[PDB]
A and B are shown apart, each in its own frame.
With several copies, the nearest count.
Chain A
Amino acid sequence: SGLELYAEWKKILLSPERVHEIFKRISDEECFVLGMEPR
């Protein structure tokens, strides 16, 4: 929505920090699966 995200199952605002926390936990293997070179 505009420049921000929403999560709905019941709807919440998804902040960049929450996304950062989630992404920081993602592993190298998951990055390769996602097609992103972790290095």
Chain B
Amino acid sequence: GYKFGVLAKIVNYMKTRHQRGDTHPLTLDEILDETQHLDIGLKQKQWLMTEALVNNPKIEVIDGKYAFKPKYNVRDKKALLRLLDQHDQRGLGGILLEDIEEALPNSQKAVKALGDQILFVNRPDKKKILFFNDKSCQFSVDEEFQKLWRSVTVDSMDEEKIEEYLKRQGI
């Protein structure tokens, strides 16, 4: 445990500590006390202080302490809408639902409030991706027309025919 077990508890405690709502920045000493790993070697303390506590994608140094990046975490409907909107404007794409649910407890309340403004894509691993519904150019057709559309082959044709189909009527 002295090698990875102690550092893992540091990471796990800090990660779980944020789930308790104590978003305030924390120090390694506070985590070492809360994890009772005061006996961890000096080289390990400084290593975790300089690497594990700064390289994690959710941890940032604030006034010399480590914080859970409150600006990145989505915790309200406006932040959810704005983030997806800005992401869509920048072409960044969608965001995994789990990233919001981990940031905002019961994210479904914010998600269901936005409704059709959020587009849900389900990955092969069953995870959901949220996308902004930019209504600049929207169009839909009836099942009969979607059926009609699916009925016509496109790939099993020659390029000559694709061009010929146009000129058949004399254009």
**Does A11 sit at the interface, judged by CB under 8 A?**
no
Q: Which residues between 18 and 36 of chain A lie within 8 Å of chain B, taking CB atoms?
A: 18, 21-22
Q: Which residues of B contact A21 (CB under 8 A)?
A: 156-158, 161
Main secondary structure of the interface of A (DSSP, over half): helix
Number of A-B residue pairs with CB-CB distance less than 8 Å in the complex they form: 10
Q: Which residues of A contact B158 (CB under 8 A)?
A: 18, 21-22
Q: How many chain-B residues does the 8 Å CB contact rule pick out? A: 5
Chain A interface size band reads under 10
B152 vs chain A, min Cβ distance (A):
13
A24 vs chain B, min Cβ distance (A):
11
Nearest-CB residue, chain A, relative to B156:
A17
Q: Which residues of A contact B157 (CB under 8 A)?
A: 21
Nearest-CB residue, chain A, relative to B157:
A21
Nearest-CB residue, chain B, relative to A20:
B156
Q: What is the interface of chain B, defined by CB distance below 8 A to chain A? A: 153, 156-158, 161
